[PDB]
Design a binder for this molecule. Structure first.
Ligand SMILES: *Cc1cc2c(cc1C)nc1c(=O)[nH]c(=O)nc-1n2C[C@H](O)[C@H](O)[C@H](O)COP(=O)(O)OP(=O)(O)OC[C@H]1O[C@@H](n2cnc3c(N)ncnc32)[C@H](O)[C@@H]1O
Ligand SMILES: OC[C@@H](O)[C@@H](O)[C@H](O)[C@H](O)CO
Length: 414
C-alpha cells in the first residue's frame, strides 16, 4: 500500500502501515524494529513522520481510543491516537472542557502536541500546555512515564515523536463553558498602531485575523468570546453581514456558527464544525511564531511583499499564544504572535515564496511550526531554541541508538 499525509504532498517510503492491536504487540514491534516513526492523522506537511527506507511507520489506530475522564480531579486520560473531536465531545458530556482547540478538530492529540499545535488567545497556551503526564513506549519496549515537575518534562510533550511512542497523555480540564463567535470584515492595517493591535488581539478569549494579502489590511476578524466574560464594542471593523469562511470563496457552511450565537466551547473554538470531515486537502501550510512585540513589524514586512505572497495564498491567519514551557515549542519562553499561511498546493511555486517570507522574518527570531512547510536552515533553527541542547540530551538518554530519530529530527539536532 501507498501511505501519504493528509494533504497528499508527502508520500511515505513505507509499503505498510503497522497497526498493532495490543500494547503487547506494540512493545514487541518497537523492541524488534531498528527505526520507528509514528503516524498520527498525517496533518503535517513535511517529512517529520517519514521513517526512511527500512524504517517502520506505525499507527495507534488499531489500539482502543481511550478517553477516561476523572471528574473529581478534572483530568482526562487519552490514547495517543485519539482525535480532538472525540476527546471534546466526551469531556463536554461530563461537564468539562479544554482551554483551547486547533482550527479543525479531526487531528490526533499526540500528533498535535508533538509539533507545537496552538489556537489563539493572549492568555491561552499551546495545546501541549494542558498536558500533565505522558506515557511512552521507549526503544527497548519498556514504558517511561514523565509528569509535570520532572526535570525532563519540558522536552517530553512537544518532542517531535523522538522519545518513543506516546501511548497515553493526561490532560487538565476546567468546567464546561459557553462561547459566542462574532465576525468582522475589513480591519485596516493603516493606523493599526501598537496599542490598537494589542486591543484587537485581547478583545476576546481567542481572536484571529485573516487576510489574502491582496487589498491592504485584513479581510476578517474572528472574536471567539466566552459568555462568562465581558465583550466591549469592537469599533475597528464592520460586523459581518453573512456567514464567513476564512478563505474567500470557500463554503461558509463548513464553518462554526457565527453572529454571536452562544454554543458550547468545543463548537466555537474550531473554525470548522465537527461535520466537516475532509479525508484530504488541496493546500500546503507554513507558520512562523515570533515574540509578540514583533507582531506589527512582521505584519508590515508581509504587507511590503504582499504581491509575492498573494498569488500562492488561500488565506493568512494571525493568532497569539501564551509562552510555552516545552523546550521545542515554537512558543517556548515568550508570549508569541503566530503568522500562518494556507497556501495553494503547488510546491514548486510555494517554496520560492516561503524562502522570501523567511528572509523578511529573520530579524524577528521567527520559529517555524514543526508540522508545516519551512526552509529555515538547521543551524539557524538550533540558534532559535535556548533549550534545544537539553532536548538533544534527553533524546540521547531515552533513545541512545536514535531508533525514533529520522532524517528530519537528525537535521534539527545535528
Ligand atoms: C491538516 C491541518 C493541520 C493543522 C490544522 C488544521 C488542519 C486541517 N490546524 C492547526 C492549528 O489550528 N494550529 C496549529 O498550531 N497547527 C494546526 N495544524 C497542524 C497540525 O495540528 C500539526 O501539524 C500536528 O502535529 C499534526 O498532527 P498529526 O497527528 O495529524 O500529524 P502526523 O504527521 O501524523 O504526526 C505529527 C508528528 O507527531 C508524531 N506523533 C504522532 N503520534 C504520535 C504518538 N502517539 N507518539 C509519538 N509521536 C507521535 C509523528 O511521528 C510526527 O512527528
Ligand atoms: O494553523 C492551521 C490554521 O491556520 C488553518 O487550518 C486555517 O484556519 C484554515 O486554512 C482557514 O481556512
Amino acid at each position: 500500500i501507498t501511505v501519504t499525509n493528509w494533504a497528499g504532498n508527502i508520500t511515505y517510503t513505507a509499503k505498510e502501515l503497522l497497526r498493532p492491536h495490543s500494547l503487547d504487540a506494540l512493545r514487541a514491534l518497537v523492541a524488534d524494529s531498528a527505526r520507528v516513526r509514528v503516524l498520527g492523522s498525517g496533518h503535517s506537511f513535511n517529512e517529520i513522520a517519514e521513517p526512511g527506507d527500512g524504517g517502520v511507520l506505525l499507527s495507534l489506530a488499531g489500539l482502543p481510543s481511550v478517553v477516561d475522564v476523572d471528574t473529581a480531579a478534572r483530568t482526562v486520560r487519552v490514547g495517543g491516537g485519539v482525535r480532538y473531536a472525540e476527546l471534546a465531545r466526551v469531556v463536554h458530556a461530563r461537564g468539562l472542557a479544554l482551554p483551547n482547540m486547533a482550527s479543525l478538530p479531526h487531528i490526533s492529540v499526540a500528533g498535535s502536541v508533538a509539533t507545537g499545535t496552538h489556537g489563539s488567545g493572549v492568555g491561552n497556551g499551546s495545546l501541549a500546555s494542558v498536558v500533565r503526564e505522558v506515557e511512552l513506549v521507549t526503544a527497548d519496549g519498556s514504558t517511561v512515564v514523565i509528569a509535570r515537575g520532572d526535570e525532563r518534562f519540558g522536552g517530553a510533550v512537544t518532542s517531535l515523536g523522538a522519545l518513543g511512542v506516546v501511548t497515553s497523555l493526561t490532560l487538565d480540564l476546567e468546567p464546561a463553558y459557553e462561547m459566542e463567535q462574532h465576525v468582522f470584515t475589513e480591519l485596516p492595517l493603516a493606523g493599526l498602531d501598537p496599542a490598537t493591535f494589542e486591543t484587537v488581539m485581547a478583545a476576546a478569549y481567542s481572536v484571529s485575523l485573516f487576510t489574502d494579502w491582496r487589498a491592504p489590511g485584513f479581510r476578517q476578524v474572528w472574536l471567539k468570546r466566552r459568555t462568562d466574560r465581558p465583550l466591549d464594542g469592537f469599533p475597528y471593523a464592520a460586523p459581518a453581514a453573512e456567514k464567513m469562511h476564512p478563505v474567500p470563496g470557500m463554503p461558509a457552511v463548513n464553518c462554526t456558527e457565527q453572529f454571536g450565537v452562544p454554543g458550547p466551547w468545543h463548537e466555537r473554538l474550531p473554525h470548522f464544525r465537527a461535520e466537516f470531515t475532509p479525508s484530504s486537502g488541496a493546500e500546503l501550510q507554513s507558520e512562523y511564531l515570533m515574540p509578540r512585540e514583533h507582531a506589527l513589524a512582521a505584519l508590515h514586512a508581509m504587507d511590503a511583499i504582499r504581491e509575492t505572497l498573494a498569488p500562492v495564498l488561500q488565506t493568512c491567519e494571525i493568532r497569539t499564544v501564551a509562552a510555552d514551557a516545552q523546550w521545542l515549542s515554537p512558543a517556548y519562553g515568550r508570549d508569541t504572535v503566530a503568522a500562518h499561511f494556507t497556501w495553494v498546493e503547488d510546491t514548486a511555486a510555494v517554496l520560492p515564496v516561503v524562502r522570501r517570507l523567511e528572509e523578511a522574518l529573520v530579524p524577528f527570531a521567527a520559529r517555524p511550526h514543526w508540522g508545516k512547510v519551512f526552509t529555515v536552515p538547521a543551524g539557524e533553527l538550533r540558534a532559535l531554541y535556548p533549550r534545544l541542547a537539553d532536548f538533544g540530551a534527553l533524546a540521547g538518554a531515552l533513545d541512545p541508538a536514535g531508533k525514533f530519530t529520522n532524517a528530519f529530527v537528525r537535521g534539527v539536532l545535528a
